Structure formats: C-alpha cells, structure tokens
Design a protein around this nucleic acid. Structure first.
Length: 59
RNA sequence: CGACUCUUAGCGGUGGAUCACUCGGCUCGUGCGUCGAUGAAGAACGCAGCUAGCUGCGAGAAUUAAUGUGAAUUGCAGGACACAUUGAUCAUCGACACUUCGAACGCACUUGCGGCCCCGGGUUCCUCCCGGGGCUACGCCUGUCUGAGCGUCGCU
C-alpha cells in the first residue's frame, strides 16, 4: 500500500464473540427481590395515619 | 456520776480470707493429618412471636430436605404432632440453598459510572424509560481465528 504517517499503529484484527460449550452456572439465580420482598410491612404510627388521611399517602 | 480513752469477751456490722467443691486449665501420649477463582481464611450487615449479648444461621436466615430416633420444646404464649393415611424433639448429615466486602474479578471504592447479548412491562423493532438474566479482571499453557514485518525465500 502507501504509508503517509511516520507512526506505525497496531492493525485492527478480528474479535470473535464468545460461544461457550457449556454455561458456567447451570441456572439463572432466582430474583430474591420480588414484590413481597420489597414491601415488608406498613407503618401504623400517628404520623403515618395523618399521611393516610390528610395526604393520601401510604407509609 | 457521767463523757472520753484503753483492754477483754458476747452479739451486730464497712470485708470476703479459710475450707469443701469444679461442664476449666496445664502436661504427656495415641490415631488421623482435610483450605481456596466450583470463591478460602477473615471482616460487615442482617435473621427469632416476645430476644439485647453469647450461640446458630444467610432473603428458604436460632433454619429447608433426607436418614436414624420415637413423644416432646419450655421463660411465657400459640398451634402442630389425631403419637400410622408414617412422626414432636434431638442427633446425623450424602440433597437443596448460601446477602455485602475480602486473593476479589466490568471500571472505581462513593450503595458512583459503564459496555455487549437476551427477556418482561410502558411505546413499539427510538431500543427511549423502568425491572430482570447472562457475560465483561491479571498472568499463563495447548489449540483457533485475524494480522504485521525494506525477516528468509518461491512463483509471478
């Protein structure tokens, strides 16, 4: 070809995607952050009830 | 007289010696002689109906399953187990599960910021938003692919 720059750069090559012969872990881990784990229990304090009545917010 | 002071004895007290005890040590001896990227040791934070610490455990958290055992656990309560339409408790333990750091592994140590490939929901191939899953560290070995070289050459 032709060289127009005095700098030699590392030529770009081919990079294959991973095609494993086996998965390293047998199964995906179960998501232990479901809806039941997110909500633990409501608050029932005096401040909490004031938000339910005067603010339309659950705590 | 008393008070005060001294001594002795009795009894009572500031005190915890002595004696008796010991699920603890120390020493000797015997048999084994086994950790970890399939993530160790060590940390952190959590987990009980009432439970702070010790202990045990890991979001299935003072435990699940299985086997053996065979009627308890216990401080209170509650309800199992009808005590074979097979099972309380305990032991054993080979199945399952095992949060965050840590050799610690996408980059960085602040609950900071990414990238690639998939899945679900809003919209519909904006992959734009949210949620989830799998990968994404260094060194090094065999092989594989893609390359470089006025390195040595061959055919042109």
């Amino acid at each position: 070809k032709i060289r127009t720059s005095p700098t030699f750069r590392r030529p770009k090559t081919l990079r294959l995607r991973r095609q494993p012969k086996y998965p390293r872990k047998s199964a995906p881990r179960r998501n232990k952050l479901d809806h039941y784990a997110i909500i633990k229990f409501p608050l029932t304090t005096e401040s909490a009830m004031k938000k339910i009545e005067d603010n339309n917010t659950l705590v």
